[PDB]
Amino acid sequence: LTEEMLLKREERARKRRLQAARRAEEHKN
Amino acid sequence: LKGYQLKGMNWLANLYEQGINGILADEMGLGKTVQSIALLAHLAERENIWGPFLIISPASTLNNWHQEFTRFVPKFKVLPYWGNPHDRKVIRRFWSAPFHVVITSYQLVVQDVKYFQRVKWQYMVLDEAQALKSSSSVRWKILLQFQCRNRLLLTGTPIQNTMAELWALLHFIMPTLFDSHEEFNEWENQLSRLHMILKPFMLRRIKKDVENELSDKIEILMYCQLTSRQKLLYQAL
Amino acid sequence: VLIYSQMTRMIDLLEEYMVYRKHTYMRLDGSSKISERRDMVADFQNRNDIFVFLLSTRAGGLGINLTAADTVIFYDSDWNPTVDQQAMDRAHRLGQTKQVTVYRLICKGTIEERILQRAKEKSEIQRMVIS
Ligand SMILES: Nc1ncnc2c1ncn2[C@@H]1O[C@H](COP(=O)(O)OP(=O)(O)O)[C@@H](O)[C@H]1O
C-alpha cells in the first residue's frame, strides 16, 4: 500500500550499471 | 615495477603528502603510465576508494589507459569519457563506488566544463602534457579551474620552447610561486635559477640511466634528388 | 616500419602507393575515430603480417606505443623538434627487445633544409634547458 515503488526502483537500478558497463566495453577494441 | 619507477613512487608519495604539484618528465619509453598507475596502490589510505582520480590526455592515448589499469592494478575500476554524446552521458550520470578513475580527451574536457566541475576530482593526471604549453589556449584557461589537490604532469619531453611556454606549464603546476612571464626572464646563471626552481618538482632520466640492454637509435639523414616535375614547379614558385 | 607525414593529402598519396605495390598497410590520420585508433594499434601489435603503419606526428603518434615496429621513417619534419623525438620513441621504448633504425627523407636546396636548420638551432637551445 506504500512500499510499491521498490519493485519499480530495482528494475531501473539494475539497468544503470548494466548499460554504463555495456558502453564501457564498446571501449574494449 | 623497476628501481627508477619505485624512486619516482616514493618521490610522488612525498610530494602528495607535502601538497606539491610536479612533472614526471622522464624520457619517452621509460613508462609514465606505469610510473603513475601505482599511485592508487601506494596511497592506500582509502581516499582513492571514496573519491576519484582523473586522467586528461590526447585522444590517441585512450588506447593504453583503459587497458593498463586492467593488467597492472585491476583493484581500481575505470570508466572512460569518450565516444558519442549520448553514450558518454549514459556512462557519466551516475557519478551524481565504481568511479576510482576516469580517462578523458582534451577536446571533451575543454567543452564539458560544468559536468566535470560538479565532481570533486581529488588528484589529477595530465598527459602528453606539452598540450598546455600556451596560456592563450582555451585548454589552459579552463584546466586551471578544477579543484584538485595534487596535479601531476606526464610530459613526454618537458618544456623545450620560448619563455612564455615555460611560464604556461609552470603556472599550471603552481598558481603561486611565479609573478609574470615578462619578469620570469630572471627566474648563463638564469639556467641555474630554472634548474633550482625545477629540481624540487620535476624528475629527470636520460634513457641510459635505466636501459643497460636496449639499443640506441641509428639515425639516418637521407637526402633525395628531387625530380624534373619537382624542379619545374619549385622554380615556378 | 612506421611512416610519419604532416599532410593528410600526403598520407592519401602514401596509401595509394602502398595499396598499389601490395605491401599491406594501415593508417591513422586525425580524422580517424578513437575506437578505430584502438583497433588499428591492437592489430599492428599482436600480428605477423602488416608491414607498414602510416601516421601524423601531432595526432597519429600521441603516446600510442607501437612496440611491434622495428624501424621509423619521417616523410615529413615539423618546424619544432620534440614532435619527431616523441614520434621516434612511440616505437623506441622499454617494450622493445631489438635494434632501432630511424630515417628522415629531405630534398637538398629546397625548403626542408630551412626546417632542418630551425630544427637543429631549436634542438641545441632545447638541450641546455634540460642538461
Ligand atoms: N614493467 C613493464 N611492463 C610492461 N610495460 C612497461 C613496464 N614498465 C614500463 N612499461 C611501458 O612504459 C609505457 C607506459 O608509459 P607511457 O605513458 O605509455 O610511455 P611514456 O613514458 O613514453 O610517456 C608503455 O610502453 C609500457 O608498455
User: In angstroms, rounded to a whole number, what is the distance separating the alpha carbons of residues B166 and B189?
Assistant: 17
User: In angstroms, rounded to a whole number, what is the distance separating the alpha carbons of residues B180 and B46?
Assistant: 39
Q: Which residue from C90, C80, C116, C64 is spatially nearest to B134, judged by alpha carbons?
A: C80
Give the strand pairing for B123-127 and B53-57: parallel
**Cell digits of residue B30:** 621509460
Whether chain C has a CB inside 8 Å of the CB on A29: the answer is yes
Nearest CA to ligand 1 atom 26: B31
DSSP run (H or E) holding B57 = strand B53-57
Within its chain, how far is the Cα of A24 from the centroid? 14
**Cell digits of residue B56:** 586528461
- Beginning with the edge strand found earlier in the chain, give each strand of the sheet holding C71-74 in spatial order: B217-224, C100-107, C71-74, C2-4, C52-55, C25-28
Report the structure determination method. cryo-EM
**Cell digits of residue A23:** 558502453
Nearest CA to ligand 1 atom 14: B31
Helices (H), ranges, B19-137: 34-37, 39-42, 47-50, 65-72, 85-92, 106-109, 113-117
Distance from CA of C105 to the nearest CA of B (A): 5
- Beginning with the edge strand found earlier in the chain, give each strand of the sheet holding B150-154 in spatial order: B22-23, B150-154, B123-127, B53-57, B101-105
User: In angstroms, rounded to a whole number, what is the distance separating the alpha carbons of residues C78 and C81?
Assistant: 6
* DSSP conformation class of B26: P
Q: Using CB atoms, list chains with 3+ pairs below 8 Å to chain B.
A: A, C
Ligand 1 atom at minimum distance from C93 CA:
25
Nearest CA to ligand 1 atom 5: C95
**Cell digits of residue B163:** 619563455
Report the separation in Å between the CA atom of C101 and the middle of ligand 1, taken as the mean of its atom positions: 20
Strand boundaries in C1-131, DSSP class E? 2-4, 25-28, 52-55, 71-74, 100-107
The residue type at B107: Q
Q: Which residue from B40, B44, B56 is spatially nearest to B125, judged by alpha carbons?
A: B56
The residue type at B197: I
Q: What is the resolution in angstroms?
A: 3.5
Contact between chains at A24 and B90 (C-beta distance less than 8 A)? no
Contact between chains at A26 and C42 (C-beta distance less than 8 A)? no
User: In angstroms, rounded to a whole number, what is the distance separating the alpha carbons of residues C44 and C37?
Assistant: 11
Q: Which residue from B92, B5, B98, B102 is spatially nearest to B54, judged by alpha carbons?
A: B102
**Cell digits of residue B27:** 624520457
- Three-state SS for B154? strand
Report the separation in Å between the CA atom of B171 and the middle of ligand 1, taken as the mean of its atom positions: 28
Phi, psi for C117 (deg, rounded to 5): -65, -50
Count how many Cα atoms sit within 13 Å of the Cα of residue C54 in the half-sphere of its side chain: 24
Left (φ > 0), alpha (ψ -120 to 50) or beta: where does B167 sit? alpha
DSSP run (H or E) holding C40 = helix C34-44
Distance from CA of B39 to the nearest CA of A (A): 23
**Cell digits of residue A29:** 577494441
